Amino acid sequence: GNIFANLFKGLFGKKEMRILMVGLDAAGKTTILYKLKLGEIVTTIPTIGFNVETVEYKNISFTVWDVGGQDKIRPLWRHYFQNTQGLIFVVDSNDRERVNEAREELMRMLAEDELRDAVLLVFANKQDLPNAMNAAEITDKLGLHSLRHRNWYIQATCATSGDGLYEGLDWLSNQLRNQK
Amino acid sequence: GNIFANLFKGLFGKKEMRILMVGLDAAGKTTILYKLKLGEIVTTIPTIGFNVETVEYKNISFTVWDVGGQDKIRPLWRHYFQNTQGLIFVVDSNDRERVNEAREELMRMLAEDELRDAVLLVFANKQDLPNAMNAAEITDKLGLHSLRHRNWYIQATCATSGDGLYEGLDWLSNQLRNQK
Amino acid sequence: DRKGGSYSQAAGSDSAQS
Amino acid sequence: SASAVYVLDLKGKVLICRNYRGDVDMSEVEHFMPILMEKEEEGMLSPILAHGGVRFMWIKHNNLYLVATSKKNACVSLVFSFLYKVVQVFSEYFKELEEESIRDNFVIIYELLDELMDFGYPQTTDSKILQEYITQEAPRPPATVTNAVSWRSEGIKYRKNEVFLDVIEAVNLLVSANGNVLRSEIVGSIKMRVFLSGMPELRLGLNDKVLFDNTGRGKSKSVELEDVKFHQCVRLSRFENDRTISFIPPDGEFELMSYRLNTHVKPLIWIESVIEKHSHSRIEYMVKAKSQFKRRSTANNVEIHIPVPNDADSPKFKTTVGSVKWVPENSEIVWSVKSFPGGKEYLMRAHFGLPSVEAEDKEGKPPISVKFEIPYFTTSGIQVRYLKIIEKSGYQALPWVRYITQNGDYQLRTQ
Amino acid sequence: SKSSVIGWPAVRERMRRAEPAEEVGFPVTPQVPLRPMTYKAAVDLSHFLKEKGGLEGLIHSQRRQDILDLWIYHTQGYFPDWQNYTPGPGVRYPLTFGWCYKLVPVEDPEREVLEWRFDSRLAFHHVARELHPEYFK
């Protein structure tokens, strides 16, 4: 066999990568996905089902599958976990009551044998008000440091401002892609 | 497809634009509309229903739909909000008691998701007596500076004199039309 | 071809059941 | 025990009537229409009417009401079965069920009605047997009706012995508005179009759970149908004795067995709907479809029907995969997809305005139903073992069968 | 059978890798016939396994038996039901007549260690059928 075509394709960029869009409802997951794909904060209707979109950055097409945080859509995240390589969790630092629910949902998602090769992607959503926690308080509350055998990274991103999305994308690419 | 006909139409002027006529009763809204369309201060009966008229200026036909400030006609402004692109609010600077009512009506009109793409058009009506406020005091009282995501402009126009109507029309055209 | 699944040959009985 | 079975019309005119007992006057048909109109206007309309001491049972046909008036306490189930048999015979003889064929084949229709039943007791019900003695374009009655084998006509000769089977699967999911599936039942359908020479006795054999347990091979994937109904030619004695599906195949397309059991697996297509409907301002359709079926199976002609507003107008569709068309007659938007491979995720964003004037009365929340149909997929996992085709003369048969998976009562409750 | 010969080494390697003790749906190949393995087919498969090795003397396991049945079904379309063992305790005869492979003890029936052993008399003597006439119908 010959891999000349594969080498030629990889010389100019062949890797694409994957990503997931999960989190509690009203946690900026849809806004984060829109900012990653388009770059603007557009108001959208509640995600009754799911949102499918692709984002190309650094020569890698990291497709993001938006998943709602509704009760009827929370158990449907397992359907989108199949044929998925990445997962991004959007935390609601401004929702103290919903913080526990988001942490429980993240623990349930990470406590599945099928979702084991996907590194943790915790995004501190709603990072625009004083009530939002920092990149360490949210992780400590969610117990991201205790996720053994999982590469979890806590990043603070504001949907209105869009800051930190580039850093999170770069961290995800570094975790997934291990090439020069 | 071909857009040669559209380009030919736009070369000599094709854009029309829209406008609305809302405000408190006896606030010069009907007088302002008459001055915009005809150019004279003509006394009219109270607007029980609504007034429909069109004004062509700068090659744009900005139609104005007069809406009364009566209690029975105040909730009817939502009917005229459909298929409307602009909205002009006439304030009563000489009516201190009615100033709060006009501000509340403007806030209610601007607090609707349907009326979001229409920029604020605040006209300082009754700008002919010493009791009338300036272009900043009226806006400050009405809170026009706090209308986020809304292009609100405060202009002082006297129904008897007619001054400032041209400036308001030019500002509305600049806000709506973004071409050379 | 045919929509809804191509026709496949069927046996006569369970040969493993004797 | 209907006194007389007659075929009505959409305007109340009786297309054709045939009294069987004579105990009910033929003038009672005229009063049936006013009774039906009164019942419809008051919600008390039922298929089995009642005109005083005589009950006029009627069935809603394609274009006419098959009113079967009865006088005594006759078998309602028997009357319904006779009406269904008559409808099937008419459909077999006439490809169209309307007033065009009612008044076009009256000469043969009267003969068929007379031969079908006498004195209120049906006698002939086989379409092939009826066509072999009564035709629209007469010899003695065939011996097949008199003989025990009334579902396999002897003497049939064909150049080749080819039988086309159809493993029809109906996936019905009753998903409530809360997101949980309430009624999830899958009904099997083993229909074979046998076209051979002679009257072979089919020996049906599949990977049945009961048969596997009886034979000691209850360790592989076996289909355990909760309800299994055999065809008319299928001998119930063999099935009760040792589950032996031995019967004479019919001449043509027929339903041999029809499995019916509950389904405890995840739905083939997972559809989540979002209703971002503003207060008389706009409407949002956040419809997301997730393919829960295997990626190797593609749902051909997938049409997820999302009910839009009744008064909604000027709608805009923002989807990713599959064309979205709004039908004003249906008052809903169907997410039609030509090919829907398993595991596909289709997201749609509907946006349309609403009239300023609010509706006078509510319109309800009809459930969202999808029309997914992925062929060559066996969700139940039941595999046919063998088909024992035996003929007295002796010939080599080449039976064929295809497995088709479609969506039946797959309705998702609206929010 | 070139395909069967090619699949025999991979099947044997997979069985050896599995210790002795994710996708939903039931896809079906288009136009591929499906029927239970015949007595002659079972005898031929047993002879081929004995000649190529990896079947006689291997520790009997549920995973290994399932893998072998799946490989046989993929290679020839035979249903993975004829490679059944007779009820224990002790040596389990082939479930389908004609099979030359059987499971015998190598030391509760489940905790007993079983090993696949070639049985030429199994293809000619219905030991499993005689032991369980009811199971044979």
Ligand SMILES: Nc1nc2c(ncn2[C@@H]2O[C@H](COP(=O)(O)OP(=O)(O)OP(=O)(O)O)[C@@H](O)[C@H]2O)c(=O)[nH]1
């Ligand atoms: N305005 C604003 N909203 C934010 C900000 N950060 C997070 N959000 C949330 O992001 C949400 C955007 O809604 P969506 O587009 O539907 O995305 P989502 O948060 O995942 O909501 P669902 O799709 O229904 O699960 C808003 O409801 C906010 O609660 C922010 O900085 N400003």
Ligand SMILES: Nc1nc2c(ncn2[C@@H]2O[C@H](COP(=O)(O)OP(=O)(O)OP(=O)(O)O)[C@@H](O)[C@H]2O)c(=O)[nH]1
């Ligand atoms: N005379 C005079 N009237 C003015 C002036 N500025 C505003 N107005 C008001 O403009 C009103 C004209 O009446 P209309 O033609 O009916 O217009 P309107 O103010 O919207 O009143 P309605 O149509 O009933 O809502 C008068 O009643 C005045 O109160 C001004 O400078 N001079």
Ligand SMILES: [Mg+2]
């Ligand atoms: Mg969203």
Ligand SMILES: [Mg+2]
């Ligand atoms: Mg007026």
